[PDB]
Amino acid sequence: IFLNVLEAIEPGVVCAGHDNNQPDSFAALLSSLNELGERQLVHVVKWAKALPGFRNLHVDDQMAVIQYSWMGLMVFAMGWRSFTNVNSRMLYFAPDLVFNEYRMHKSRMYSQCVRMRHLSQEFGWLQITPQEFLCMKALLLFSIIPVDGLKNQKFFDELRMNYIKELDRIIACKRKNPTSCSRRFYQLTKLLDSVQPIARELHQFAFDLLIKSHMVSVDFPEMMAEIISVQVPKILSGKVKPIYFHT
Ligand SMILES: C[C@]12CCC(=O)C[C@H]1CC[C@@H]1[C@@H]2CC[C@]2(C)[C@@H](O)CC[C@@H]12
Protein backbone atom coordinates (compact mmCIF):
# COMPACT_ATOMS: atom_id res chain seq x y z
CA ILE A 1 0.00 0.00 0.00
CA PHE A 2 2.95 2.26 0.77
CA LEU A 3 4.29 2.14 -2.79
CA ASN A 4 0.81 2.71 -4.25
CA VAL A 5 0.62 6.03 -2.41
CA LEU A 6 4.04 7.35 -3.43
CA GLU A 7 3.27 6.44 -7.05
CA ALA A 8 -0.21 7.95 -6.72
CA ILE A 9 0.96 11.22 -5.19
CA GLU A 10 3.99 11.81 -7.41
CA PRO A 11 3.57 15.34 -8.80
CA GLY A 12 3.66 15.77 -12.57
CA VAL A 13 5.63 17.98 -14.95
CA VAL A 14 6.34 21.50 -13.81
CA CYS A 15 7.47 24.16 -16.28
CA ALA A 16 9.49 27.20 -15.28
CA GLY A 17 7.94 29.61 -17.76
CA HIS A 18 11.33 30.47 -19.17
CA ASP A 19 11.63 32.52 -22.35
CA ASN A 20 13.98 30.52 -24.54
CA ASN A 21 14.02 33.15 -27.29
CA GLN A 22 15.83 35.53 -24.96
CA PRO A 23 19.63 35.22 -24.52
CA ASP A 24 21.01 33.20 -21.61
CA SER A 25 21.76 35.94 -19.09
CA PHE A 26 22.60 35.35 -15.41
CA ALA A 27 19.50 37.30 -14.39
CA ALA A 28 17.34 35.45 -16.92
CA LEU A 29 18.41 31.96 -15.84
CA LEU A 30 18.25 32.62 -12.09
CA SER A 31 14.89 34.38 -12.30
CA SER A 32 13.48 31.40 -14.18
CA LEU A 33 15.03 29.02 -11.68
CA ASN A 34 13.55 31.17 -8.88
CA GLU A 35 10.11 31.11 -10.51
CA LEU A 36 10.52 27.39 -11.05
CA GLY A 37 11.28 27.31 -7.35
CA GLU A 38 8.01 28.97 -6.38
CA ARG A 39 6.15 26.60 -8.69
CA GLN A 40 7.65 23.36 -7.41
CA LEU A 41 7.32 24.54 -3.81
CA VAL A 42 3.55 24.55 -4.28
CA HIS A 43 3.66 20.95 -5.54
CA VAL A 44 6.06 19.68 -2.87
CA VAL A 45 3.77 21.15 -0.22
CA LYS A 46 0.79 19.22 -1.64
CA TRP A 47 2.88 16.08 -2.08
CA ALA A 48 4.36 16.01 1.42
CA LYS A 49 0.96 16.52 3.05
CA ALA A 50 -0.50 13.52 1.20
CA LEU A 51 2.39 11.35 2.41
CA PRO A 52 1.64 8.29 4.56
CA GLY A 53 1.60 9.20 8.26
CA PHE A 54 2.51 12.84 7.60
CA ARG A 55 -0.46 14.17 9.62
CA ASN A 56 1.04 12.33 12.62
CA LEU A 57 3.48 15.25 12.84
CA HIS A 58 2.62 18.38 14.77
CA VAL A 59 1.34 21.25 12.62
CA ASP A 60 4.34 23.62 12.64
CA ASP A 61 6.63 20.60 12.32
CA GLN A 62 4.77 19.55 9.20
CA MET A 63 5.66 22.95 7.83
CA ALA A 64 9.15 23.03 9.36
CA VAL A 65 10.14 19.73 7.80
CA ILE A 66 9.01 21.03 4.40
CA GLN A 67 10.72 24.44 4.68
CA TYR A 68 14.02 22.73 5.52
CA SER A 69 14.04 19.87 3.06
CA TRP A 70 12.76 21.57 -0.12
CA MET A 71 16.23 22.19 -1.58
CA GLY A 72 17.19 18.56 -1.15
CA LEU A 73 13.90 17.21 -2.43
CA MET A 74 13.94 19.34 -5.57
CA VAL A 75 17.55 18.62 -6.53
CA PHE A 76 17.01 14.88 -6.11
CA ALA A 77 13.90 14.93 -8.28
CA MET A 78 15.68 17.15 -10.78
CA GLY A 79 18.60 14.78 -10.82
CA TRP A 80 16.07 12.06 -11.58
CA ARG A 81 14.35 13.94 -14.41
CA SER A 82 17.80 14.35 -15.91
CA PHE A 83 18.40 10.58 -15.78
CA THR A 84 15.19 9.54 -17.53
CA ASN A 85 14.71 12.37 -20.03
CA VAL A 86 18.34 12.91 -21.03
CA ASN A 87 20.64 10.30 -19.49
CA SER A 88 22.12 12.87 -17.14
CA ARG A 89 23.75 14.62 -20.08
CA MET A 90 22.31 18.01 -19.17
CA LEU A 91 20.35 19.13 -16.11
CA TYR A 92 16.59 18.75 -16.56
CA PHE A 93 15.13 21.46 -14.33
CA ALA A 94 11.97 21.70 -16.39
CA PRO A 95 10.91 20.89 -20.00
CA ASP A 96 11.43 24.56 -20.85
CA LEU A 97 14.51 25.07 -18.64
CA VAL A 98 17.24 22.59 -19.54
CA PHE A 99 20.79 23.58 -18.60
CA ASN A 100 23.72 22.72 -20.81
CA GLU A 101 27.40 23.56 -20.28
CA TYR A 102 26.87 27.04 -21.59
CA ARG A 103 23.92 27.60 -19.28
CA MET A 104 25.78 25.94 -16.39
CA HIS A 105 28.64 28.40 -16.78
CA LYS A 106 26.25 31.10 -17.86
CA SER A 107 24.46 30.82 -14.49
CA ARG A 108 27.61 31.44 -12.46
CA MET A 109 26.56 28.14 -10.91
CA TYR A 110 29.21 25.94 -12.52
CA SER A 111 30.63 23.58 -9.88
CA GLN A 112 27.26 23.22 -8.20
CA CYS A 113 25.72 22.04 -11.50
CA VAL A 114 28.65 19.62 -11.85
CA ARG A 115 27.68 18.01 -8.54
CA MET A 116 23.99 17.72 -9.55
CA ARG A 117 24.88 16.30 -12.96
CA HIS A 118 27.15 13.97 -10.98
CA LEU A 119 24.14 12.96 -8.84
CA SER A 120 21.93 12.30 -11.88
CA GLN A 121 24.60 9.91 -13.08
CA GLU A 122 24.56 7.94 -9.83
CA PHE A 123 20.92 7.13 -10.65
CA GLY A 124 22.41 5.39 -13.67
CA TRP A 125 25.74 4.11 -12.34
CA LEU A 126 23.68 2.22 -9.75
CA GLN A 127 20.72 1.36 -11.91
CA ILE A 128 18.45 3.05 -9.35
CA THR A 129 14.89 1.74 -9.40
CA PRO A 130 11.80 3.96 -9.85
CA GLN A 131 10.47 2.40 -6.67
CA GLU A 132 13.74 3.07 -4.86
CA PHE A 133 13.73 6.64 -6.15
CA LEU A 134 10.28 7.35 -4.72
CA CYS A 135 11.10 5.87 -1.31
CA MET A 136 14.44 7.64 -1.22
CA LYS A 137 12.72 10.93 -2.10
CA ALA A 138 10.19 10.45 0.68
CA LEU A 139 12.99 9.73 3.14
CA LEU A 140 14.58 13.04 2.11
CA LEU A 141 11.68 15.02 3.61
CA PHE A 142 12.62 13.68 7.04
CA SER A 143 16.34 14.30 6.72
CA ILE A 144 16.98 17.74 8.21
CA ILE A 145 15.97 19.12 11.58
CA PRO A 146 16.74 21.72 14.31
CA VAL A 147 19.49 20.51 16.65
CA ASP A 148 17.16 21.38 19.53
CA GLY A 149 14.53 19.13 17.94
CA LEU A 150 11.02 19.84 16.63
CA LYS A 151 7.79 20.40 18.57
CA ASN A 152 7.08 16.65 18.83
CA GLN A 153 10.44 15.01 18.01
CA LYS A 154 8.89 11.66 18.95
CA PHE A 155 6.35 11.56 16.12
CA PHE A 156 8.99 12.71 13.64
CA ASP A 157 11.26 9.89 14.83
CA GLU A 158 8.46 7.36 14.37
CA LEU A 159 7.80 8.75 10.92
CA ARG A 160 11.47 8.73 9.90
CA MET A 161 12.19 5.18 11.08
CA ASN A 162 9.19 3.71 9.24
CA TYR A 163 10.27 5.33 6.01
CA ILE A 164 13.74 3.90 6.44
CA LYS A 165 12.23 0.46 6.95
CA GLU A 166 10.31 0.93 3.68
CA LEU A 167 13.42 1.86 1.67
CA ASP A 168 14.81 -1.32 3.16
CA ARG A 169 11.78 -3.40 2.23
CA ILE A 170 11.79 -2.37 -1.43
CA ILE A 171 15.32 -3.73 -1.37
CA ALA A 172 14.29 -7.12 -0.02
CA CYS A 173 10.84 -8.24 -1.22
CA LYS A 174 10.87 -10.46 -4.33
CA ARG A 175 11.62 -8.42 -7.45
CA LYS A 176 15.41 -8.31 -7.74
CA ASN A 177 16.34 -10.36 -4.67
CA PRO A 178 20.14 -10.74 -4.43
CA THR A 179 21.63 -11.22 -0.96
CA SER A 180 22.96 -7.72 -1.67
CA CYS A 181 20.30 -6.50 0.78
CA SER A 182 23.28 -4.85 2.46
CA ARG A 183 25.59 -3.54 -0.26
CA ARG A 184 22.54 -1.99 -1.96
CA PHE A 185 21.57 -0.28 1.29
CA TYR A 186 25.01 1.11 2.05
CA GLN A 187 25.06 2.65 -1.43
CA LEU A 188 21.57 4.21 -1.43
CA THR A 189 22.03 5.66 2.06
CA LYS A 190 25.38 6.83 0.69
CA LEU A 191 23.63 8.46 -2.24
CA LEU A 192 21.04 9.91 0.15
CA ASP A 193 23.79 11.50 2.28
CA SER A 194 25.33 13.06 -0.85
CA VAL A 195 22.35 15.26 -1.73
CA GLN A 196 22.90 17.19 1.53
CA PRO A 197 26.29 18.78 0.77
CA ILE A 198 24.97 19.67 -2.68
CA ALA A 199 21.90 21.22 -1.06
CA ARG A 200 24.10 23.27 1.25
CA GLU A 201 26.03 24.82 -1.62
CA LEU A 202 22.76 25.83 -3.21
CA HIS A 203 21.45 27.12 0.14
CA GLN A 204 24.40 29.46 0.56
CA PHE A 205 24.18 30.44 -3.11
CA ALA A 206 20.47 31.23 -3.07
CA PHE A 207 21.08 33.30 0.06
CA ASP A 208 23.84 35.54 -1.31
CA LEU A 209 21.88 36.04 -4.50
CA LEU A 210 18.83 37.15 -2.54
CA ILE A 211 20.78 39.67 -0.44
CA LYS A 212 22.11 41.46 -3.51
CA SER A 213 19.33 40.30 -5.82
CA HIS A 214 18.14 43.71 -6.94
CA MET A 215 21.74 44.70 -7.60
CA VAL A 216 21.85 42.09 -10.38
CA SER A 217 18.31 42.25 -11.82
CA VAL A 218 17.39 38.90 -10.30
CA ASP A 219 13.72 38.56 -9.29
CA PHE A 220 12.76 36.40 -6.32
CA PRO A 221 9.10 35.39 -6.05
CA GLU A 222 7.29 35.80 -2.72
CA MET A 223 7.54 32.31 -1.21
CA MET A 224 11.19 31.96 -2.22
CA ALA A 225 12.29 35.25 -0.69
CA GLU A 226 10.59 34.31 2.54
CA ILE A 227 12.08 30.83 2.94
CA ILE A 228 15.57 31.88 1.86
CA SER A 229 15.66 34.75 4.37
CA VAL A 230 13.77 32.95 7.16
CA GLN A 231 14.50 29.21 6.99
CA VAL A 232 17.75 28.74 5.05
CA PRO A 233 19.71 31.02 7.43
CA LYS A 234 18.90 28.64 10.28
CA ILE A 235 20.50 25.87 8.24
CA LEU A 236 23.53 27.99 7.35
CA SER A 237 23.89 29.33 10.91
CA GLY A 238 23.85 25.77 12.18
CA LYS A 239 20.51 25.84 14.03
CA VAL A 240 19.05 23.15 11.79
CA LYS A 241 21.17 20.45 10.27
CA PRO A 242 20.72 17.41 8.02
CA ILE A 243 20.52 13.89 9.40
CA TYR A 244 23.28 11.78 7.83
CA PHE A 245 23.28 8.01 7.68
CA HIS A 246 27.06 7.79 7.64
CA THR A 247 28.89 9.99 10.11
C1 LIG B 1 15.19 24.46 -6.15
C2 LIG B 1 15.50 24.89 -7.65
C3 LIG B 1 14.17 24.98 -8.49
C4 LIG B 1 13.50 23.59 -8.79
C5 LIG B 1 14.54 22.62 -9.40
O1 LIG B 1 14.16 21.74 -10.17
C6 LIG B 1 15.98 22.76 -9.08
C7 LIG B 1 16.43 23.71 -8.25
C8 LIG B 1 17.95 23.75 -7.94
C9 LIG B 1 18.55 25.19 -7.99
C10 LIG B 1 17.73 26.24 -7.17
C11 LIG B 1 16.27 26.28 -7.76
C12 LIG B 1 15.43 27.46 -7.14
C13 LIG B 1 16.16 28.84 -7.20
C14 LIG B 1 17.58 28.79 -6.52
C15 LIG B 1 17.49 28.59 -4.95
C16 LIG B 1 18.53 29.99 -6.86
O2 LIG B 1 18.29 31.22 -5.96
C17 LIG B 1 19.98 29.39 -6.68
C18 LIG B 1 19.84 27.83 -6.78
C19 LIG B 1 18.38 27.65 -7.30
Curated annotation (Swiss-Prot):
One of its GO terms (biological process) is androgen receptor signaling pathway. Keywords: Cytoplasm, Disease variant, DNA-binding, Isopeptide bond, Lipid-binding, Lipoprotein, Metal-binding, Nucleus, Palmitate, Phosphoprotein, Receptor, Steroid-binding, Transcription, Transcription regulation, Ubl conjugation, Zinc, Zinc-finger. GO terms for cellular component: axon; chromatin; cytoplasm; cytosol; dendrite; nuclear matrix; nuclear speck; nucleus. Residues 1-247 are annotated as: Interaction with CCAR1. The modification Phosphotyrosine is found at Y244. Phosphorylated in prostate cancer cells in response to several growth factors including EGF. Phosphorylation is induced by c-Src kinase (CSK). Phosphorylation by TNK2 enhances the DNA-binding and transcriptional activity. Phosphorylation by PAK6 leads to AR-mediated transcription inhibition. Ubiquitinated. Deubiquitinated by USP26. 'Lys-6' and 'Lys-27'-linked polyubiquitination by RNF6 modulates AR transcriptional activity and specificity. It comes from the Eukaryota. 17beta-hydroxy-5alpha-androstan-3-one binds at N34, R81, A206. The record marks K49 as: Interaction with coactivator LXXL and FXXFY motifs. Its main location: nucleus. There is a cross-link at K174, K176 (Glycyl lysine isopeptide (Lys-Gly) (interchain with G-Cter in ubiquitin)). Residues 1-228 form the NR LBD domain. Residues 1-247 are annotated as: Interaction with LPXN. The record marks E226 as: Interaction with coactivator FXXLF and FXXFY motifs. GO terms for molecular function: androgen binding; ATPase binding; beta-catenin binding; chromatin binding; DNA binding; DNA-binding transcription activator activity, RNA polymerase II-specific; DNA-binding transcription factor activity; enzyme binding. It is found in: Nucleus; Cytoplasm. Steroid hormone receptors are ligand-activated transcription factors that regulate eukaryotic gene expression and affect cellular proliferation and differentiation in target tissues. Transcription factor activity is modulated by bound coactivator and corepressor proteins like ZBTB7A that recruits NCOR1 and NCOR2 to the androgen response elements/ARE on target genes, negatively regulating androgen receptor signaling and androgen-induced cell proliferation. Transcription activation is also down-regulated by NR0B2. Activated, but not phosphorylated, by HIPK3 and ZIPK/DAPK3. Binds DNA as a homodimer. Part of a ternary complex containing AR, EFCAB6/DJBP and PARK7. Interacts with HIPK3 and NR0B2 in the presence of androgen. The ligand binding domain interacts with KAT7/HBO1 in the presence of dihydrotestosterone. Interacts with EFCAB6/DJBP, PQBP1, RANBP9, RBAK, SPDEF, SRA1, TGFB1I1, ZNF318 and RREB1. Interacts with ZMIZ1/ZIMP10 and ZMIZ2/ZMIP7 which both enhance its transactivation activity. Interacts with SLC30A9 and RAD54L2/ARIP4. Interacts with MACROD1 (via macro domain). It is linked to Defects in Ar are a cause of androgen insensitivity. Rats with this syndrome are called testicular feminized (TFM). In the absence of ligand, steroid hormone receptors are thought to be weakly associated with nuclear components; hormone binding greatly increases receptor affinity. The hormone-receptor complex appears to recognize discrete DNA sequences upstream of transcriptional start sites. Belongs to the nuclear hormone receptor family. NR3 subfamily. Composed of three domains: a modulating N-terminal domain, a DNA-binding domain and a C-terminal ligand-binding domain. In the presence of bound steroid the ligand-binding domain interacts with the N-terminal modulating domain, and thereby activates AR transcription factor activity. Agonist binding is required for dimerization and binding to target DNA. The transcription factor activity of the complex formed by ligand-activated AR and DNA is modulated by interactions with coactivator and corepressor proteins. This is Androgen receptor. It comes from Rattus norvegicus (Rat). The lineage of its organism: Eukaryota, Metazoa, Chordata, Craniata, Vertebrata. The gene is Ar. The chain holds residues 655 to 901 of 902 of the full protein.
